[PDB]
Design a protein around this ligand. Structure first.
Ligand code: Y6Y
Ligand code: Y6Y
Ligand code: Y6Y
Ligand code: ADP
Ligand code: ADP
Lengths: 96, 576, 576
């Protein structure tokens, strides 16, 4: 994103930091314990080399929370705060 | 001797040092029966000439501890191999007179090594000093206080636990402290009645305690040169009565201020702004929202804790230029009585051009030290404008300085006191990451001042100037349909300029009239224009102009409605 | 011995040093009965050969203080471990003869460490010198004056409070001071009647006192070589009468000036401009506005203070090239009798290309020291032009040099004396931040000279040249419908060139005539063309040209009306 995304730089998707991350991952796996998890809101602009085998190949899509998921999120956010039982949370989650 | 009265500036770190050192020194026997570790070392740092040595001496005198002064270059000037003996003997002597205070003035000379560490013998001196400082067996009550211009100048191992574990930034004295410093430095010269030391104190921005003393001495010397020299009656010792007959006049102080050259004007200022809500005539919704966001967490922290809500620590003001965003930030800081730090756009542009963003880390650390503080990033969109705005660079909105600011903010919130306020006249080009949660998410829009707001702005601008009651201010404010605060200030300044020019020209002619035709009886009619009149304001308003066009206000209205709360929930009702 | 008469240049810092040192030295007993701290150290800095040591010696002689000279390399050339003894003994000896003055010539050798601080023994010397300098127990009246090329060359701890707390920049002598230096250096050579030392002084720009002495010596040696060598009558001691018979002619001085090579031409000049309002024929509205903005705050500061108005300290001249903006700035500086510093565009471009904007800080500090001063930034739009102007760089108008200038201006105004004047031929591309309040907000438009203004410009350009009364100047000025000041200067220069060529060719032919046909009786008819005539001016005007097209004047008119005072308030009346 910093380099662009629609036009960007004249060069390709490769950058210094991602290249170093790829080198470390390629030199990784020896440890058998470190597990790399990557989160990105712009999958289109992510470097394709990141998704090659031996890298973050398992792509997982996180969709918008469902009604039940929304209810759980509201409960988690409001667990600490004193919430009156009168306010129905399922209705609010479904409304959103 | 020297005491708290001598220590001027009322900068409120002397109180912190007192709270630090009384019990270790004022009640030394108490720590013998209680298991607690007192402050083994205190690092006083700040601009030179701020009285750090004076503060240490005053604390030593007021607490009865045996004060020992280890001058930096005094030991450094000694021959290699025997300076170490001097340092060791100094610590032993201070140990003997328990409790004792060992003050190391100019610590950045004994242990200047910042891991560069040039030379050989200086490495020995730093290591031996480290051994001594860490060698305090917690017996007796020797407290080692050191002076340094900046914390990072001394060796980092000196900053570690047990050597110097707590630091106090004395900093430049403020207007209130500058006035108190002037009072302390002007107490035996028999100051004149006309001179008040208040106007000089306000005009004395940028001076330090040493600078204030030098200015007072220069004014005294000007007084001595102006008078008592013409008579030329001098002896071995000037007569006390003859010297007392002179009074330091305001003119002498004014000349001295003109000849001051303060020794660190550039140094950043950490000061409680004097601006008040009165200066801003309105923004009641904005005023209440700012009061909420800033004041409520501190005034009523318990109620924030009860609901398990963490108050936002960032607010971004957006609006047309000249509407009072900087003034609003100063007012909000003043209401909470918290220190205010302002980072204008030139500083950010300098950090960006120079590729030196580590200054952001230093700025945030300074804001953290001066808590409670309101860290204001004025005109934060300057870097985006510098890179473009319509097309700009090929890359995105991310830049080095904003990225460093985001990193510091993400690593912030720990302090619980620093509050970040951002002002930007171009919200469209501001980096979106700035507005994410945990950052300056609370966007506040500052609109053009209303009629009542315009009246208040005019009154604030014209409070100092003599304004005749004939000139109606409400009519002028209402007449200005869309003038910004800057436009109103320009109108007031132009009216004052017209009045000043007319007064100067008139009294100049009147003086010709007395030179050309010497009148037999001298009878001055006073000033031909003693206050600003209706005609001056009419001529000034003739040149009134609207700096802010309606198209840029339209863009701001667009962004405001670009933060639109949806259009389907306005009638949300729970099922009952 | 040496005194104020020997000290030449009339540079007006000797007076400041006198005011500094009389009472501490001229009236030492006075400070015994009065509690005041005198100047413990004074740092004289400037280009080498400016007479700093001479000034110190003259002050010591004229005040009776025992002068002690501690040569930099004299102590530095001594063996390590015993040079410290030399410095300590020098201070003790100066202490014995109280009052005494200790002069440290070439201080940048004893303590050159700028925090780089190479070596080991030199660190000892700097630290011990620091201990001695700070070790002055305020007893006796020893004043330590030091000489250094630049303030930043010496160790910063030497610049701190109590070591060297006040600095004086002797600087390069000016035309008036160059003339006085020539007079002092030409007093025993029996200067000839034809030589006046005024033309040489004007042509002597760039020389220092040492340079002036060297030029005078070279002229004397040329005189000795030209005569008294042909006779070759020499003995053990040349006869006084024989040597007195020679007179240094203007030709010898001219040759010496040709063979001068001044030792610091590049050094920036801080000089009161000799230009006067007479050189500019008009701009009465502009002249009065400039008089207001600059002169009024100082001539009548009391009236500015009465109305609570702070006068603007920045003015931006905009207009077509060659209209006299630089001359106007020089004239305004001359009227106020304040030092003038000019920063032309090449300097800004050099700072921008080299990525060295810290020079702006140095320039502003120099302007601050030479107060009252008029800091003029000539052709400030050069960087914008260098980056483009129609498309330019992808980024905005902000650049490193302008940002540094803005930072210095924002940190300025404290001095109350420096006044910033900006000239730009491309107001459209100038950064808008430059025009914000607190910056060069007062925009002044310099239009093409009028008919009367053109007449005045022609008279000023032709004042030195011999112009025949036959050639009517008003007609020529009126004839030039839109010629700029530069165009008029070019026309005058071309006319002078034509006259010079005609005179040279004619006298050359006339000399052939005498060589070809030796006349029996020599009777020179004098010069065939003694002054500039109508035909020369007609031929020159034949090549007259309008450098400034009407389209760029149209753009300037657009910007001028782009600062339009609205169109609805012209009839503003208060309700009565
Ligand atoms: C047996 C095996 C274990 C392994 O590692 C297991 C492991 N332990 N800790 C961790 S990490 C920790 C767990 C939670 C956070 C991270 N892991 C691990 C490994 C991979 C992915 N996630 C975790 C690798 C590779 C192998 C094998 C597979 C086939 C053959 S053959 C010649 O074809 O017959 C030989 C060897
Ligand atoms: C109680 C609390 C106070 C706080 O800090 C208060 C504070 N003091 N000085 C300042 S600063 C100064 C004031 C004027 C200028 C700046 N602040 C402050 C904090 C935030 C925003 N503005 C000011 C933070 C967070 C909490 C909490 C909230 C919920 C829970 S739980 C587990 O859900 O039950 C636990 C802890
Ligand atoms: C009285 C005053 C003088 C001043 O400075 C005057 C000055 N002297 N040398 C110079 S410089 C030199 C002159 C020729 C070349 C440059 N100046 C000067 C100042 C501004 C612009 N040009 C010159 C500033 C500000 C003030 C004041 C105004 C209002 C108030 S109140 C609280 O509202 O009642 C308090 C203080
Ligand atoms: N607030 C103050 N009250 C009285 N004197 C002050 C004050 N601030 C600075 N000074 C002056 O500063 C002089 C030297 O400064 P100092 O105390 O040594 O600080 P530093 O070591 O940082 O330079 C002192 O002689 C004192 O007169
Ligand atoms: N204004 C002056 N009047 C008389 N002599 C001068 C003057 N300026 C410079 N000189 C000459 O400069 C010579 C040496 O320069 P000096 O005084 O030592 O200055 P610096 O130490 O900076 O080089 C002196 O011998 C003196 O003759």
């Amino acid at each position: 994103k910093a380099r662009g995304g629609n036009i960007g730089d004249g060069g390709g998707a490769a950058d210094r930091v991602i290249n170093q991350i790829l080198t470390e991952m390629d030199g990784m796996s020896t440890k058998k314990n470190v597990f790399i998890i990557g989160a990105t809101n712009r999958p289109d602009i992510i470097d394709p080399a990141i998704l090659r085998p031996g890298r973050l190949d398992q792509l997982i899509y996180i969709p918008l929370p469902d009604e039940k998921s929304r209810v759980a999120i509201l409960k988690a956010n409001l667990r600490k705060s004193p919430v009156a039982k009168d306010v129905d949370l399922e209705f609010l989650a479904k409304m959103t | 001797e020297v005491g708290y009265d001598d220590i001027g500036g009322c900068r409120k770190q002397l109180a912190q040092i007192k709270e630090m050192v009384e019990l270790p020194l004022r009640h030394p026997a108490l720590f013998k029966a209680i298991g607690v570790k007192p402050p083994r070392g205190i690092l006083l740092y700040g601009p030179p000439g701020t009285g750090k040595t004076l503060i240490a001496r005053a604390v030593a005198n007021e607490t009865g501890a045996f004060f020992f002064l280890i001058n930096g270059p005094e030991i450094m000037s000694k021959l290699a191999g025997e300076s170490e003996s001097n340092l060791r003997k100094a610590f032993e002597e201070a140990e003997k007179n328990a409790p004792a205070i060992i003050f190391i003035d100019e610590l950045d000379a004994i242990a200047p090594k910042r891991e560069k560490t040039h030379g050989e013998v200086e490495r020995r001196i730093v290591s031996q000093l480290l051994t001594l400082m860490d060698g305090l067996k917690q017996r007796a009550h020797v407290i080692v206080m050191a002076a340094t211009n900046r914390p990072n100048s001394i060796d980092p191992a000196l900053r570690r636990f047990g050597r110097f574990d707590r630091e106090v930034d004395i900093g430049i004295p403020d207007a209130t402290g500058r006035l108190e410093i002037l009072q302390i430095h002007t107490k035996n010269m028999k100051l004149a009645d006309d001179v008040d030391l208040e106007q000089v104190a306000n005009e004395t921005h940028g001076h330090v305690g040493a600078d204030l003393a030098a200015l007072c001495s220069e004014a005294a010397l000007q007084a001595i040169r102006k008078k008592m020299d013409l008579i030329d009656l001098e002896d071995e010792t000037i007569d006390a009565e003859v010297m007392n007959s002179l009074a330091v006049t305001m003119d002498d102080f004014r000349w001295a201020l003109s000849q001051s050259n303060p020794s660190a004007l550039r140094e950043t200022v950490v000061e409680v702004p004097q601006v008040t809500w009165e200066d801003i005539g309105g923004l009641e919704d904005v005023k209440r929202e700012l009061q909420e966001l800033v004041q409520y967490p501190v005034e009523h922290p318990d109620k924030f804790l009860k609901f398990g809500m963490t108050p936002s620590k960032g607010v971004l003001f957006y609006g047309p230029p000249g509407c009072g965003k900087t003034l609003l930030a100063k007012a909000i800081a003043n209401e909470c009585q918290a220190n205010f730090i302002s980072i204008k756009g030139p500083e950010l542009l300098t950090m960006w051009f120079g590729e030196s963003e580590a200054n952001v880390r230093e700025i945030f650390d300074k804001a953290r030290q001066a808590a409670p503080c309101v860290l204001f990033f004025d005109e934060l969109d300057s870097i985006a404008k510098a890179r473009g705005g319509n097309i700009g660079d090929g890359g995105g909105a991310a830049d080095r300085v904003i990225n460093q600011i985001l990193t510091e903010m993400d690593g912030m919130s720990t302090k619980k006191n620093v509050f970040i306020i951002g002002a930007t006249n171009r919200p469209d080009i501001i980096d979106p990451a700035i507005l994410r949660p945990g950052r300056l998410d609370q966007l506040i829009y500052i609109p053009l001042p209303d009629e009542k707001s315009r009246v208040a702005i005019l009154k604030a601008n014209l409070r100092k100037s003599p304004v005749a009651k004939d000139v109606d201010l409400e009519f002028l404010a209402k007449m200005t349909n869309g003038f910004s605060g800057a436009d109103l200030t320009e109108i007031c300044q132009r009216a004052c300029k017209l009045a000043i020019r007319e007064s100067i020209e008139s009294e100049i002619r009147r003086e010709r009239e007395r030179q050309t035709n010497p009148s037999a009886m001298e009878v001055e009619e006073d000033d031909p224009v003693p206050e600003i009149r209706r005609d001056h304001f009419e001529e000034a308003m003739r040149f009134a102009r609207r700096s802010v066009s309606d198209n840029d206000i339209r863009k701001y209205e667009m962004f405001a409605q670009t933060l639109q709360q949806s259009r389907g929930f306005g009638s949300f009702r729970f099922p009952s």
